[PDB]
Design a protein around this ligand. Structure first.
Ligand SMILES: CCCCCCCCO[C@@H]1O[C@H](CO)[C@@H](O)[C@H](O)[C@H]1O
Ligand SMILES: CCCCCCCCO[C@@H]1O[C@H](CO)[C@@H](O)[C@H](O)[C@H]1O
Ligand SMILES: CCCCCCCCO[C@@H]1O[C@H](CO)[C@@H](O)[C@H](O)[C@H]1O
Ligand SMILES: N[C@@H](Cc1c[nH]c2ccccc12)C(=O)O
Ligand code: NA
Ligand code: NA
Length: 509
């Protein structure tokens, strides 16, 4: 069974896992829609009571399960909890990361398509100066790439270039994954993370130099880092902060677990985990938070920046930022550094999203890595056509897989590992072989605070958001729900087959 060759490589893979589009696209938007500093306070609390505790749990389970020749939650849950239901609950450990990949890798291919276009300088050019007049050419640039429907029909019509770029993006993903953990994920991680960090730092440094009558990037930084206690009372920001912490650290997806299942039985996870997490957070709060927002505040001011943030998840990064850059010296090339950055950020994450599926086919169905990778790619590529052609389908998958799903699963694995499997055995399995030990206080957070914190949160989310689901929405949302539900059924079947092959290979040996 493959292992991480070096400690550094492991850290970088785990950090490349968490450091993605969420750091440079999602965080700024989330931080802005919530008043900046108002969002930061709950964000810090979430990182301590949730982000970190659960972080160690997933490493513990990954390494615990990895020892016994398993890298996925269906099998691992069964080990921590010998029950047929524990295997069915573990199916999400394959479903969630697989669903996320379906739309994530597509957004990833965008950054690749923009990077290329920007490199060759095949971009729009606004005349020298109205915000709408300069932004419009960029909106039209994105809407033409992904093929936003002009007509009432909710149908997307992506360009030939966009479609092929997706093929390439998938191909690049496969080329890395087909090499395995050390030769592939780890090898690429070492080169990708440093590069990423360099690009980010350069962009942050370059962004600061932005200066206009409307303001400066210095103002924007004061907006996000200004603590406001008035908004603290609202649950909206708490749910936003905790949802972001989950997405950024990649928790409740089962991806961290698969990666960690390649860590050696006694090898440290306490420090290793802590570090990789800290790397993501440092990159998110410092690097990701200093580019998008400060640039918009500079060129547009705060109020209008928040307006742009609330406008869309891609508006800031795919339209505004490139437009803001097109006004600066060497903006187009700077746009290429931006999208190239994103592409490496997403690529290190998309490979981690497909690894659980790859690990399952290998560990449980005894498929060669070559076959495990090609079929997984085939499933992701095929499934992605829904996201590419069916308007709003992307939104749907992100809500269930990357939003509601990851929290439900976070509480599940936490309960199984600590409550069912035993709180003390979990503690040993976590601290065992740890270069350092987990603070005794976190023992109580894990067993009591985190699950209660999550439980209450989920209920609150259910009380206000549940009415919305199926109450009123376009019927096309069912096309996505129908498919992703079928995805779960298909994954349940494989689990069923994996348990049956296990039975024959027991009597025959
Ligand atoms: C490569 C796999 C076979 C093609 C999958 C069938 C659907 C893709 O269809 C393709 O969509 C593109 C974007 O709309 C168009 O530009 C292409 O002309 C069209 O062939
Ligand atoms: C890394 C670059 C990938 C190859 C780029 C191929 C996509 C561009 O293809 C172009 O698409 C246009 C719109 O459909 C057509 O008008 C052109 O005839 C066609 O060459
Ligand atoms: C919804 C998931 C499946 C989407 C696949 C759509 C395949 C595209 O379908 C074809 O696209 C052509 C453009 O290249 C159009 O000219 C044709 O009219 C259309 O049949
Ligand atoms: N964590 C990545 C994106 C992501 C979300 N869930 C994941 C699950 C597995 C791998 C990556 C992810 C980011 O910060 O942008
Ligand atoms: Na990444
Ligand atoms: Na992240």
């Amino acid at each position: 069974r493959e292992h991480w060759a070096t400690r550094l490589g492991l850290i970088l893979a785990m950090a490349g896992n968490a450091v993605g589009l969420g750091n440079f696209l999602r965080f700024p938007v989330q931080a802005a829609e919530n008043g900046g500093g108002a969002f930061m306070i709950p964000y810090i609390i979430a990182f301590l009571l949730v982000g970190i505790p659960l972080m160690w749990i997933e490493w513990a389970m990954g390494r615990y399960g990895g020892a016994q020749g398993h890298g996925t939650t269906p099998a691992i849950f069964y080990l921590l909890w010998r029950n047929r239901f524990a295997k069915i609950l573990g199916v999400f450990g394959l479903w969630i990361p697989l669903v996320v990949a379906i739309y994530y890798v597509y957004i990833e291919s965008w950054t690749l398509g923009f990077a290329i276009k920007f490199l060759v300088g095949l971009v729009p050019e606004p005349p020298p100066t109205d915000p709408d007049s300069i932004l419009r050419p960029f909106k039209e640039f994105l809407y033409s790439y992904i093929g936003v429907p002009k007509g009432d029909e909710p149908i997307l019509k992506p360009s030939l270039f966009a479609y092929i770029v997706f093929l390439i993006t998938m191909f690049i993903n496969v080329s890395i994954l087909i090499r395995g953990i050390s030769k592939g994920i780890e090898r690429f991680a070492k080169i990708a993370m440093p590069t990423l960090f360099i690009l980010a730092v350069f962009l942050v440094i370059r962004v600061f130099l932005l200066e206009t009558p409307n303001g400066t990037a210095a103002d924007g930084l004061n907006f996000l880092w200004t603590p406001d206690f008035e908004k603290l009372k609202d649950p909206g920001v708490w749910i936003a902060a905790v949802g972001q912490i989950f997405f950024t650290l990649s928790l409740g997806v089962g991806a961290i677990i698969t990666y960690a299942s390649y860590v050696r039985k006694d090898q440290d996870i306490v420090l290793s985990g802590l570090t990789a997490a800290t790397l993501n957070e440092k990159a998110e709060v410092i690097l990701g938070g200093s580019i998008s927002i400060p640039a918009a505040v500079a060129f547009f001011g705060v109020a209008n920046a928040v307006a742009i943030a609330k406008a869309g998840a891609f508006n800031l990064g795919f339209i505004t930022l490139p437009a803001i850059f097109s006004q600066t010296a060497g903006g187009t090339f700077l746009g290429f550094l931006w999208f190239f950055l994103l592409f490496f950020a997403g690529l290190t994450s998309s490979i981690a999203q497909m690894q659980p599926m790859i690990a399952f086919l290998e560990d449980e169905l005894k498929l060669s890595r070559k076959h495990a990778v090609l079929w997984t790619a085939a499933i992701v590529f095929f499934s992605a056509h829904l996201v590419m052609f069916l308007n709003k389908s992307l939104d749907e998958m992100d809500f269930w897989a990357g939003t509601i799903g990851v929290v439900f699963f976070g509480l599940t694995e936490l309960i199984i590992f600590f409550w069912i499997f035993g709180a003390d055995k979990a503690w040993e399995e976590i601290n065992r072989g740890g270069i350092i030990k987990v603070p005794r206080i976190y023992y109580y957070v894990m067993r009591y605070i985190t699950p209660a914190f999550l439980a209450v949160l989920l209920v609150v989310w259910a009380r206000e958001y549940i009415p919305k689901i199926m109450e009123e929405t376009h019927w096309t949302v069912w096309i996505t729900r129908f498919y992703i539900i079928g995805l779960f059924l298909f994954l349940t079947f494989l689990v069923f087959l994996a348990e049956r092959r296990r039975n024959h290979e027991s009597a025959g040996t």
